[PDB]
């Protein structure tokens, strides 16, 4: 009669590494690394992302005409640019502190787009119908939906002053532009005053702008330029615009709501009616395991990105069947 | 392995022991078979479960220095977490295999300590009794209630 002590073996082919030995076959192991994605853009907490498509953040917020389908979207779980996000500033120029503006939008989960200065009541004694072929739409010259090109009327551009008081209970993003014509003749044809100025002031913002006339290498058929500026008007505060030329005035502004856990990613993936807790630019990934090697850029409740190709912990025994 | 049992003095595992991680094979006049040690298997499952749960818990063209600092931060954190993840898994895998080895060794020594010189120790994990050990006797060995005085006289006669 005999009794023997022994241990379990099976047909597992799982392998793990240790410090003393590589590729040990074991009876049971656990993968610790998410290493697949579903190739889709998905909702977070039931909320879809804002897909800018062929537009970038500048084209969206200025209202580049080619971005009209974006205008009514009011809330999103993250912002998606494409490699094709080309429609931005259609009249060439510099977007001042653009990267800071993107950083601000990265924590915005919704906003209200509203008329800060109605077109036909805010700027008496000026023309408000300026368009340009650089911002075309339907093969016709057009302009930013959220700004307004003020020009002389009846050979005169009187000094203007207008103000807006923020009674939204939320920060208001205000954008405007300054036109820099290529030569003095265009300056006088558009704004009459050669030594024009613009002033924009809040309680905690102030800047003066001048025509800065200069002939530039042409971009999109324009020797002149338009610079773009923004500020965040805090609740209760007033913004004041003063000008005798060159102002590309605000028309629509944005009352901002802040949220946690948003961001901006660039992705070639398509939206589907899927749901995830963790989105990457390649696709959605699961969130149960501690690590992932799909992509360093993630949105949501996500595993930690690592470079590892394999992370596998043994739970069972060294497997020695026979 | 560190404790000498798995892939050691017990050279291989048992595909026939399907119902646990460590246990017994017996042969007597009533027959033969495998039986897991359920207490040691459950205790090991508890420990490995706790271990697994423990493990599973833009810049513009004139801002290149800031861009490179941001990249240094991202790359350095990634280096550190890749290192931490891989090293913890290697270390814990070594410890898990040694834990199983220890569990087998301890079960073997518990049987050896019950049987004393009422059985001959072959050296491959097996004991050959110096007395007839029927199914109730085998179960007493597996359950830690083996009665050495009951069989000592028969065994001493056979050990001679």
């Amino acid at each position: 009669d005999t009794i023997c002590i022994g241990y379990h073996a099976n047909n597992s082919t799982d392998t793990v590494d240790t410090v003393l030995e590589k590729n040990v076959t074991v009876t049971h192991s656990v993968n610790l690394l998410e290493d697949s994605h579903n190739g889709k853009l998905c909702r977070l907490k039931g909320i879809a992302p804002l897909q800018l498509g062929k537009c970038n953040i500048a084209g969206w917020l200025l209202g580049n005409p080619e971005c009209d389908p974006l205008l009514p979207v009011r809330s999103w779980s993250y912002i998606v640019e494409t490699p094709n996000s080309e429609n931005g500033i259609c009249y060439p120029g510099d977007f001042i502190d653009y990267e800071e503006l993107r950083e601000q939008l990265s924590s915005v989960s919704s906003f209200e787009r509203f008329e800060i200065f109605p077109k036909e009541s805010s700027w008496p004694n000026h023309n408000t119908n300026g368009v340009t072929a650089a911002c075309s739409h339907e093969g016709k010259s057009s302009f930013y939906r959220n700004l307004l090109w003020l020009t002389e009327k009846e050979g005169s551009y009187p000094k203007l002053k207008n103000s807006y008081v923020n009674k939204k209970g939320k920060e208001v993003l205000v954008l405007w532009g300054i036109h820099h014509p290529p030569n003095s003749k265009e300056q006088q044809n558009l704004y009459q005053n050669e030594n024009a100025y613009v002033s924009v002031v809040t309680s905690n913002y102030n800047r003066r702008f001048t025509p800065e006339i200069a002939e530039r290498p042409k971009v999109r058929d324009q020797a002149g330029r338009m610079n773009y500026y923004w500020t965040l008007l805090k609740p209760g505060d007033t913004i004041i615009f003063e000008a005798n030329g060159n102002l590309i005035a605000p028309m629509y502004a944005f009352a901002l709501s802040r949220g946690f856990g948003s961001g901006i990613i660039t992705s070639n993936a398509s939206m589907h009616e899927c749901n995830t807790k963790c989105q990457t630019p390649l696709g959605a990934i699961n969130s149960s395991l501690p690590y992932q090697n799909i992509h360093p850029v993630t949105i949501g409740e996500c595993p930690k990105y690592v470079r590892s190709a394999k992370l596998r912990m043994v739970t069972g025994l060294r497997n020695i069947p026979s | 392995g560190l404790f000498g049992a798995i892939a050691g003095f017990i050279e291989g595992g048992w595909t026939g022991m399907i119902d646990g991680w460590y246990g017994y094979h017996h042969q007597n006049e009533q027959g033969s078979g495998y039986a897991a040690d359920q207490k040691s298997t459950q205790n090991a499952i508890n420990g490995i479960t706790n271990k697994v749960n423990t493990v599973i818990e833009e810049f513009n063209k004139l801002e290149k220095r800031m861009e490179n600092l941001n990249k240094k931060v991202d790359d350095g954190f990634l280096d550190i977490w890749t290192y931490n993840a891989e090293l913890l898994v290697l270390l814990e895998n070594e410890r898990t295999l040694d834990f199983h080895d220890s569990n087998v060794k301890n079960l073997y020594e518990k049987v050896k300590s019950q049987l004393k010189n009422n059985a001959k120790e072959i050296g491959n994990g097996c004991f050959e009794f110096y007395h007839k050990c029927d199914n109730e006797c085998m179960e007493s060995v597996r359950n830690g209630t083996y009665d050495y005085p009951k069989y000592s006289e028969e065994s001493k006669l056979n050990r001679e």
């Binding site: 069972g316 | 119902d19 646990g20 991680w21 897991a36 499952i45």
Partner: peptide
């Protein structure tokens, strides 16, 4: 059918 293994660190144990 033998053990409490809520994480499934062991197999089915034949049952």
């Amino acid at each position: 059918c033998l053990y409490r293994d809520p994480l499934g660190v062991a197999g089915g144990m034949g049952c």
